[PDB]
Amino acid sequence: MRELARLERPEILDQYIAGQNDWMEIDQSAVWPKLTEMQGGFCAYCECRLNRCHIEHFRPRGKFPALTFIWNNLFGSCGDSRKSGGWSRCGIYKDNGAGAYNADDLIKPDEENPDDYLLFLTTGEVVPAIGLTGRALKKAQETIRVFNLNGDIKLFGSRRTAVQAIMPNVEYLYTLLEEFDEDDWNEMLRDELEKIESDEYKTALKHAWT
Amino acid sequence: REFEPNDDGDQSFLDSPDMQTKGSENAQILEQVMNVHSTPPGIAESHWLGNFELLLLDNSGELDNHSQVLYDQIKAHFGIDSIELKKADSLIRINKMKNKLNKIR
Amino acid sequence: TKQYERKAKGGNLLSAFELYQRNSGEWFEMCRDYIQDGHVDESGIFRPDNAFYLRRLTLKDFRRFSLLEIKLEEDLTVIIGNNGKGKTSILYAIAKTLSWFVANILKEGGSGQRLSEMTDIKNDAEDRYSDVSSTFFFGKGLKSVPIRLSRSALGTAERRDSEVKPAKDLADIWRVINEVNTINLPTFALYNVERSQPFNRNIKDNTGRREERFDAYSQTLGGAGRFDHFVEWYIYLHKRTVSDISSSIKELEQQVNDLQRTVDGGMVSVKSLLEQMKFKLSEAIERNDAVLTESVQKSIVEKAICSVVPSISNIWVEMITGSDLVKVTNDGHDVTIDQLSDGQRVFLSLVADLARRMVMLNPLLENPLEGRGIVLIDEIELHLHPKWQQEVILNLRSAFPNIQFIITTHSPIVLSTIEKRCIREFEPNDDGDQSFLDSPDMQTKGSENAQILEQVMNVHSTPPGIAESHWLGNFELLLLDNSGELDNHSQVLYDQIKAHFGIDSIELKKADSLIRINKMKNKLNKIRAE
Amino acid sequence: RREERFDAYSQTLGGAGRFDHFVEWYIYLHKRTVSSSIKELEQQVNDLQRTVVSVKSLLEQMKFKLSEAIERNDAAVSSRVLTESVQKSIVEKAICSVVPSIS
Amino acid sequence: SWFVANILKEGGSGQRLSEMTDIKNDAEDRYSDVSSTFFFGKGLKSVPIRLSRSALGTAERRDSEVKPAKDLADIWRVINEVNTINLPTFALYNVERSQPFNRNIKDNTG
RNA sequence: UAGUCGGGUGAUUAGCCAGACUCUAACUUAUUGAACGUAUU
Ligand SMILES: Nc1ncnc2c1ncn2[C@@H]1O[C@H](COP(=O)(O)OP(=O)(O)O)[C@@H](O)[C@H]1O
Ligand SMILES: [Mg+2]
Ligand SMILES: [Zn+2]
């Protein structure tokens, strides 16, 4: 889960008004170019490469009908509702699979940096970060539970494999901390960290590298 | 043609998997197509490496008494030449080096 | 005799029994205590003081084996190998030996099974006979019970004799002591690949009664169980539970109480039904009021089935259509047994049959499934999805904690749940002259399936007869041949990998990793050269 | 299969009067007759379904009764038939009245 | 089964759906349909077949539509009668294929 | 951990205490005969 940088609000949300208008009315191909600029063709929550994808209301339309055409509330999530059932992470699982949840107790990735809450183990679990109690522990635990960031085997395995592929390199780089001077070695680490923005599960790969 | 795992009989079409299976590793097919963990989740020993890593990260990368005990358990159970022990060794080496860098800074 | 007295007072079971037979009180009690004494451990599980298990098996000129010795675990032994290594042969040999105990528990001087003169002698054996030698253990007072089954080839003039008297002698103790005062009895069962049969509800057995205790030994080593007998027995249990009025009164009292709560909750439509049930309850109470062992037996078996069989949450008998039907809740849906998938039915059949037999043979135990016995299962993974394979051994051992299980498997998933000490593994290039079976070098319990395949089962992670299976290996070799630089040939193959496996494939990520590490290694090499 | 009125003419002129047929039939009728409007029954089934562990046996009985009522409703004028309870009573009376020394 | 029956005999009947086992337990319409479409070269791009079975209570009978199977099978049968042709193989191997071998090899009845 | 060996205690074939061992790996056996130990002479 990455810290996201929301910037500019699209024209089409100004036209439609919450209460009177329905969500199905809007042209969704208008919305995606701004989300794709923000998120980079990757999911908000799990950081898979988007191929089957839908617009996700962070606070849902059922519970919160006032929050409908609001630019804060939209995110590009993995999986498609229309195509098929049995998608079991992220936006679809938030609604159906995770029944009862406090919408307050979830990490909104545009507002908050998730790196304070979530730690990514090289074994490919995601866990509460070292030293959290009370509310920050509760937010870490519920984000993991509701978006199903361990329970989806397709996700868990795909993340575990991605990290384990680079672990020869991470081992090898830090052995050459001895021989190289700082300006060479820091250029090497910055280059790697540059490459993994274009890669999938980038937060998991960062925690391996840094 | 694969059925969805949580099909309650109302699936209209059987579909192809997303991953190419021909020439792929069996462990990948287990997880990505058959929806089964490559390591048995109902065995405690299957979690030891994860737990070991968490302990190492809690103690700024140094083997404390608790991490050493678990290391010895991993060694005793899986063996000196096991892939699991090699992973543990790797974790120690990497985390020690990361911590040394942090101290220099 | 004074000699027998000394041995018996030293704790020898056979001597105590001999003294009992010659003086036909003290000696009887010794024998009965030896069989019945035990304790409940820290985990709340009953443990007999004197365990019964197979210790060792030796096969001489039997089928594929010239001379083979196997040492078995007291709890669980798993035999692995390729097809045709003789895994089934081993279980067959054991089952025939166990048949001698079963025959003699049923009948004094009963005859067990025999080795086949047509099929069981090794084809190229110079001596034209075969031997199956077994040694069993029954506590420290009877450390060795040796049995030998033997058979000479058809048309050989010299005939080789079996030695079965020790089996008979032990089985006699069980039979005779039981006749005087009831004891718990050992369960012996074989489940081979024949357990996969089509189900027929209608074909009913008229060859004995199903509620008689020793029916538990009926066809127990035939290989299929008798799931038909289970269904009959279970319906019988149901009828008896319905018939005794106090449970019916208790059930009716519970139904009246539930209906009264519904009426108090505002549902006035069910008031007519409540009045009818209150009348039925009053009538039942008025009829002559007096826990059924049958009710407890039924509950034990239901719990066992539901605990071991993952898709089954409930099992019950319905009579209301006018015929007796066993129904189950399978994956949240109420279905008949005939509606179950073959995988579910076959596994249900195994557990149901085993539970029935244990309940019948262990009437004095609080949990009858904590009885003693030896159970043989061929191809435990038969018809099971990988998900189920990951639970099957754990569930069986939890439900039947004192049984010795001897199992065969082809499943790495099953092996990932079992300790290496329990595994017995054929050498790959055996050809039936290996003397002793051994455990694998690698620890299997908790290990990755890919590793088990390669290290234990000698199977490559990728299918060797597919070209694409070699591409990443070849790609790595090309990188190493061209001093780590991506040449025309390496680029072509990279593109092929990308095109075939896809952009987010494991294979491509590994290739990318190789490129990155090799580039970094080369940069180091250049810095060192300068 | 279910039974139908004109089964009375099956094997009537050779094959009638076999003890095994009787016993099977009689036990069947007994099991069915051990223990209302369709709409009322539909409402009762719906109420019992909403309540549903101890009432599950009662729900199954009521569902059976509803199905039978619908079937009888759906069944034709030509196949009109007395309740299984009445049938049983008449046959029992006939046997006891006719057969020497069975009361 | 409908192709096989009609290759063997004119107007041969294949197998039917079971009223007891093949109908979905909670089917509102109380019938079951198995619809199949076969291909036989560009000359015969679509051979549709439907097997149907209604539940016991029978508000209306749903009949199977098997005529195209019969028509195609007739072509194979009739042409083969005049001049030997190659014929299609149809086989099912279910889990019942796992069964013991009887050694008692029978009569050459022919 | 388990199994095994056994110096001591113990109205003593039990139990308890102490110390030790670990090739994949004991299962205590049979007389009037033979041999051995003891007794007899
Ligand atoms: N009498 C015999 N002589 C020689 N080889 C035999 C004899 N009987 C069986 N075999 C061989 O033994 C094997 C039987 O395998 P089986 O016992 O079923 O083991 P598995 O179940 O592991 O395949 C086959 O390779 C077969 O050729
Ligand atoms: Mg002597
Ligand atoms: Zn996602």
JSON list of C-alpha atoms in Angstrom, two decimals, chain A residues 52 84-88 119-123 127-128 130 152-154 156-158 160-161 164 167 170-171 174-175 177-178 182 185-186 207-210, chain B residues 2 4-6 15-16 18 27-28 30-33 35-38 47 49-50 53-54 57-58 86-87 89-91 93-94 97-98 100-101 104-105:
[
{"chain": "A", "resi": 52, "resn": "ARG", "atom": "CA", "xyz": [-9.65, -6.12, -14.88]},
{"chain": "A", "resi": 84, "resn": "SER", "atom": "CA", "xyz": [-17.85, -12.32, -12.65]},
{"chain": "A", "resi": 85, "resn": "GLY", "atom": "CA", "xyz": [-18.28, -13.15, -8.95]},
{"chain": "A", "resi": 86, "resn": "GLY", "atom": "CA", "xyz": [-15.60, -14.81, -6.78]},
{"chain": "A", "resi": 87, "resn": "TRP", "atom": "CA", "xyz": [-13.08, -11.95, -6.60]},
{"chain": "A", "resi": 88, "resn": "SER", "atom": "CA", "xyz": [-11.75, -12.06, -3.03]},
{"chain": "A", "resi": 119, "resn": "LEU", "atom": "CA", "xyz": [5.30, -3.67, 7.38]},
{"chain": "A", "resi": 120, "resn": "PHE", "atom": "CA", "xyz": [5.95, -6.16, 4.53]},
{"chain": "A", "resi": 121, "resn": "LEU", "atom": "CA", "xyz": [7.90, -9.31, 5.46]},
{"chain": "A", "resi": 122, "resn": "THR", "atom": "CA", "xyz": [10.16, -10.96, 2.81]},
{"chain": "A", "resi": 123, "resn": "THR", "atom": "CA", "xyz": [8.16, -14.18, 3.55]},
{"chain": "A", "resi": 127, "resn": "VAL", "atom": "CA", "xyz": [1.89, -7.22, 9.35]},
{"chain": "A", "resi": 128, "resn": "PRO", "atom": "CA", "xyz": [1.33, -4.27, 11.78]},
{"chain": "A", "resi": 130, "resn": "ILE", "atom": "CA", "xyz": [7.06, -2.53, 14.81]},
{"chain": "A", "resi": 152, "resn": "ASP", "atom": "CA", "xyz": [-6.08, -13.90, -0.91]},
{"chain": "A", "resi": 153, "resn": "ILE", "atom": "CA", "xyz": [-3.75, -16.77, -1.91]},
{"chain": "A", "resi": 154, "resn": "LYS", "atom": "CA", "xyz": [-3.42, -15.41, -5.47]},
{"chain": "A", "resi": 156, "resn": "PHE", "atom": "CA", "xyz": [-0.07, -13.61, -1.04]},
{"chain": "A", "resi": 157, "resn": "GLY", "atom": "CA", "xyz": [1.76, -16.03, -3.39]},
{"chain": "A", "resi": 158, "resn": "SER", "atom": "CA", "xyz": [2.22, -13.49, -6.22]},
{"chain": "A", "resi": 160, "resn": "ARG", "atom": "CA", "xyz": [5.92, -13.65, -1.97]},
{"chain": "A", "resi": 161, "resn": "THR", "atom": "CA", "xyz": [7.33, -14.81, -5.35]},
{"chain": "A", "resi": 164, "resn": "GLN", "atom": "CA", "xyz": [11.91, -13.80, -3.29]},
{"chain": "A", "resi": 167, "resn": "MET", "atom": "CA", "xyz": [16.55, -11.48, -2.66]},
{"chain": "A", "resi": 170, "resn": "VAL", "atom": "CA", "xyz": [19.58, -7.51, -2.06]},
{"chain": "A", "resi": 171, "resn": "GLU", "atom": "CA", "xyz": [22.02, -10.01, -0.45]},
{"chain": "A", "resi": 174, "resn": "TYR", "atom": "CA", "xyz": [24.97, -5.03, 0.78]},
{"chain": "A", "resi": 175, "resn": "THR", "atom": "CA", "xyz": [28.13, -7.25, 0.64]},
{"chain": "A", "resi": 177, "resn": "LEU", "atom": "CA", "xyz": [29.05, -1.82, 1.04]},
{"chain": "A", "resi": 178, "resn": "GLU", "atom": "CA", "xyz": [32.54, -2.81, 2.34]},
{"chain": "A", "resi": 182, "resn": "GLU", "atom": "CA", "xyz": [29.58, 6.03, -0.47]},
{"chain": "A", "resi": 185, "resn": "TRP", "atom": "CA", "xyz": [27.06, 2.67, -3.42]},
{"chain": "A", "resi": 186, "resn": "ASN", "atom": "CA", "xyz": [24.29, 5.29, -2.87]},
{"chain": "A", "resi": 207, "resn": "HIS", "atom": "CA", "xyz": [11.03, -2.86, 2.29]},
{"chain": "A", "resi": 208, "resn": "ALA", "atom": "CA", "xyz": [13.32, -5.62, 0.95]},
{"chain": "A", "resi": 209, "resn": "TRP", "atom": "CA", "xyz": [15.71, -3.01, -0.57]},
{"chain": "A", "resi": 210, "resn": "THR", "atom": "CA", "xyz": [15.87, -0.29, 2.14]},
{"chain": "B", "resi": 2, "resn": "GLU", "atom": "CA", "xyz": [-11.96, -23.44, -14.21]},
{"chain": "B", "resi": 4, "resn": "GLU", "atom": "CA", "xyz": [-14.64, -20.19, -9.31]},
{"chain": "B", "resi": 5, "resn": "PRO", "atom": "CA", "xyz": [-13.76, -21.46, -5.79]},
{"chain": "B", "resi": 6, "resn": "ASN", "atom": "CA", "xyz": [-16.83, -19.80, -4.15]},
{"chain": "B", "resi": 15, "resn": "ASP", "atom": "CA", "xyz": [-13.41, -19.52, -17.71]},
{"chain": "B", "resi": 16, "resn": "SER", "atom": "CA", "xyz": [-9.73, -19.90, -18.58]},
{"chain": "B", "resi": 18, "resn": "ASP", "atom": "CA", "xyz": [-5.17, -15.85, -16.17]},
{"chain": "B", "resi": 27, "resn": "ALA", "atom": "CA", "xyz": [4.02, -24.48, -7.06]},
{"chain": "B", "resi": 28, "resn": "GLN", "atom": "CA", "xyz": [2.75, -21.51, -9.08]},
{"chain": "B", "resi": 30, "resn": "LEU", "atom": "CA", "xyz": [-1.09, -24.64, -7.02]},
{"chain": "B", "resi": 31, "resn": "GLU", "atom": "CA", "xyz": [-1.37, -21.07, -5.80]},
{"chain": "B", "resi": 32, "resn": "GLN", "atom": "CA", "xyz": [-2.47, -19.18, -8.91]},
{"chain": "B", "resi": 33, "resn": "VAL", "atom": "CA", "xyz": [-4.85, -21.73, -10.48]},
{"chain": "B", "resi": 35, "resn": "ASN", "atom": "CA", "xyz": [-6.03, -21.70, -4.89]},
{"chain": "B", "resi": 36, "resn": "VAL", "atom": "CA", "xyz": [-3.85, -23.77, -2.51]},
{"chain": "B", "resi": 37, "resn": "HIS", "atom": "CA", "xyz": [-0.90, -22.60, -0.43]},
{"chain": "B", "resi": 38, "resn": "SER", "atom": "CA", "xyz": [2.44, -24.05, -1.50]},
{"chain": "B", "resi": 47, "resn": "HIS", "atom": "CA", "xyz": [5.26, -20.22, 10.08]},
{"chain": "B", "resi": 49, "resn": "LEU", "atom": "CA", "xyz": [10.58, -18.38, 9.16]},
{"chain": "B", "resi": 50, "resn": "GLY", "atom": "CA", "xyz": [7.97, -15.61, 9.17]},
{"chain": "B", "resi": 53, "resn": "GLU", "atom": "CA", "xyz": [11.94, -12.55, 10.52]},
{"chain": "B", "resi": 54, "resn": "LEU", "atom": "CA", "xyz": [9.53, -10.55, 12.68]},
{"chain": "B", "resi": 57, "resn": "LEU", "atom": "CA", "xyz": [13.06, -6.83, 12.82]},
{"chain": "B", "resi": 58, "resn": "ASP", "atom": "CA", "xyz": [11.78, -6.14, 16.38]},
{"chain": "B", "resi": 86, "resn": "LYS", "atom": "CA", "xyz": [19.64, -20.79, 4.26]},
{"chain": "B", "resi": 87, "resn": "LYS", "atom": "CA", "xyz": [16.80, -18.25, 4.10]},
{"chain": "B", "resi": 89, "resn": "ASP", "atom": "CA", "xyz": [20.95, -17.15, 7.37]},
{"chain": "B", "resi": 90, "resn": "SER", "atom": "CA", "xyz": [20.32, -14.79, 4.50]},
{"chain": "B", "resi": 91, "resn": "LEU", "atom": "CA", "xyz": [17.91, -12.75, 6.66]},
{"chain": "B", "resi": 93, "resn": "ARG", "atom": "CA", "xyz": [23.21, -11.32, 6.99]},
{"chain": "B", "resi": 94, "resn": "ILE", "atom": "CA", "xyz": [21.03, -8.74, 5.25]},
{"chain": "B", "resi": 97, "resn": "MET", "atom": "CA", "xyz": [24.30, -5.16, 7.12]},
{"chain": "B", "resi": 98, "resn": "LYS", "atom": "CA", "xyz": [21.25, -2.86, 7.04]},
{"chain": "B", "resi": 100, "resn": "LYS", "atom": "CA", "xyz": [25.42, -1.37, 10.28]},
{"chain": "B", "resi": 101, "resn": "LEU", "atom": "CA", "xyz": [24.50, 1.15, 7.58]},
{"chain": "B", "resi": 104, "resn": "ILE", "atom": "CA", "xyz": [27.04, 4.70, 10.30]},
{"chain": "B", "resi": 105, "resn": "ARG", "atom": "CA", "xyz": [24.31, 7.21, 9.38]}
]
